Amino acid sequence: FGSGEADCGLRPLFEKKSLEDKTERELLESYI
Amino acid sequence: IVEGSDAEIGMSPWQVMLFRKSPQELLCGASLISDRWVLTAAHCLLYPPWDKNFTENDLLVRIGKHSRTRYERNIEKISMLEKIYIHPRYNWRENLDRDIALMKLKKPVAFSDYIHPVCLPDRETAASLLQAGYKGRVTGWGNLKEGQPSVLQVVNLPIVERPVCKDSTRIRITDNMFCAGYKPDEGKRGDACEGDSGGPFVMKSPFNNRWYQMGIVSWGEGCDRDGKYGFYTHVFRLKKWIQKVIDQ
Amino acid sequence: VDICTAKPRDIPMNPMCIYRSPQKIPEATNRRVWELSKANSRFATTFYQHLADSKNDNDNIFLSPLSISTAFAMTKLGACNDTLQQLMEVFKFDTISEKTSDQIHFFFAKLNCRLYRKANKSSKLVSANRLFGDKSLTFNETYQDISELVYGAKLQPLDFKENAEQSRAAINKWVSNKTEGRITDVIPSEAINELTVLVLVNTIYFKGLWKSKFSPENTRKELFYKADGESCSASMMYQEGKFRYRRVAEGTQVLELPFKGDDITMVLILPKPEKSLAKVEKELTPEVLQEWLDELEEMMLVVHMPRFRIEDGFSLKEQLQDMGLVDLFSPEKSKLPGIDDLYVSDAFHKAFLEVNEEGAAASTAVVIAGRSLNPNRVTFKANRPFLVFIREVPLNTIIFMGRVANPCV
Lengths: 32, 248, 409
Ligand SMILES: *[C@@H]1O[C@H](CO)[C@@H](O)[C@H](O)[C@H]1NC(C)=O
Known about the structure:
The structure holds 3 protein chains of 3 kinds.
Chain A lengths: L23 H5 L4
Chain B lengths: L4 E2 L9 E3 L10 E6 L2 E5 H4 E2 L4 E2 L6 E4 L13 E10 L13 E6 L17 H7 L5 E6 L12 E6 L3 H7 L8 E4 L19 E5 L6 E9 L10 E5 L4 H8 L2
Antiparallel strand pairs in B: 1-11, 2-3, 2-7, 3-4, 4-9, 5-6, 7-8, 8-9, 10-11, 10-13, 12-15, 13-14, 14-15
Chain C lengths: L30 H24 L6 E3 L1 H12 L4 H10 L7 H5 L1 H15 L5 E3 L2 E5 L9 H8 L5 E2 L13 H8 L19 E10 L12 E4 L9 E15 L5 E6 L5 E7 L6 H5 L4 H10 L1 E10 L2 E7 H6 L24 E9 L23 E4 L4 E7 L4 E8 L5
Helix pairs in contact in C: 1-5, 2-5
Organism (chain A): Homo sapiens (Human)
Protein name (chain A): Thrombin light chain
InterPro entries (chain C): Antithrombin_3_serpin_domain, Serpin_CS, Serpin_dom, Serpin_fam, Serpin_sf, Serpin_sf_1, Serpin_sf_2
């Protein structure tokens, strides 16, 4: 493979800095 | 992307644009699944009808870019490809079935706040997330309407029930492709378009809060037409193959 | 008797006079019918040439050279020493086969038999051709009996001598009736007087039904750039697709849109923005065109093409004359033995082209649904005068031809 399979799916400027983006909520608010 | 909106900085690390060596010019989207593997759409590289048969060194990729044309010094990174890998049973003849293809960077990229891979799904995440009504997130620098944008466009779209997809078009749909889009009765709209192909259709997880690339901007009749939807290759449905090229 | 299933021997062919001065063949095709067609395509070009030299650059044109040829092939049935040495010299028949010559008319019937078949399985083809003379005469009556078979209708006598009003409109009445009303004023008023002794009348109407159903939702207005640089609002059709196209020398585009069936296409010559059509016009040869139709390759195009309709009616009389063809039109130096004193006053042609979206749809046209970018897609934006050729593919016969110099509404 490569490297980072462990770290993937986490944005350095969001998930990792405890931040959610403009429309992000809208998605999560749809799995209900 | 039709009816989208300007993406934020670092909102889609994995977003990778795929150019052509020379005469050098954009021609698809792609994701970044590891520091050295880029996942793109089959016919972005190989489509006999348009007589497009690209290869390892006919093209390159520009990673972690947010605008589109301005050169973002210290932010973006160019990289060539060491090898292309089109699916073996990519039925481009009837219905762009199995429209997947990954490419191995020649030299491992360097992660930063702008570069980062988007997790591939797994049976659980797939089962858990690939459901009608659930929304995903398409992203790209493709045409804005059925001209081109200035910065990575982004749009969120609900997934559609198998039937409805199959009924929106005359083409033979496959279990290796799903469709995302708003119905005409949901009022709101949007959809991927031309040049968005190869792009990633991602979904955040309510559990481990990670981003999973569920599909890939493949085809669609027109752009953002009412009663018609975009079609994305089913990334997970093709993981087995995806896996069995990286492991070797 | 059935002409399409008829044989030269099977029916009376003998005309009355005869003339005789000094690469591959298409499958399932008669060699003579071939030779004859190849001829009309030779006649066509030239006749268009002089024709466009008359009509003003901005006047768009549309005519059926074949429709003409067949008709003057009817006078040849009765055309003798000199008058004859002309028809044969002008209409390029002076190079064809012997048996073919003597029965030229016949073969035109067998040729058309073939064309009106391929042209009607899909689109609306319809024409009304007939010859007229004064009741103050009596015609061969063998000739007027062959016309019955080889030209659909026996010659027709009308009072031209005493009066010529109920006549010059009894025709415009006929044609109308025959061409389902789509053709009128075939013969302008005050053109067929008391001295008009013989007149050729050949109309036609054709509305091709595309093979790619043009879809209305994409049609919109755009500017059309005429010859005199002026703009103009036209109804512009549009579609993406795979069509045989080529960007030949001098940078002019050649595009071929086929109709449902492939037996009949429509070739569009769109000259470069600078190279005025006039240039390509006053520089046409059945070999250059055959060369274009040669270099055509399947391609991906974005097509822009005006939706229009053309009504072209006129006297061939004047035009033909200056290409030779002088006697047939003179009362003095004529020779219509195949039928007393007899010549042709005026010959009339009236073509009617109709262009617009699907009046069929594909299913395996997903080729454009692919969402990657395509740097090989080439645009054919027809919004400047361009030539038009309607042809039968295997034989490359030139059924129609014209110029769209002003399609705007
Ligand atoms: C073919 O022609 C005949 C008479 O010329 C007519 O009955 C028929 O409608 C035509 N077919 C078309 C326009 O499809």
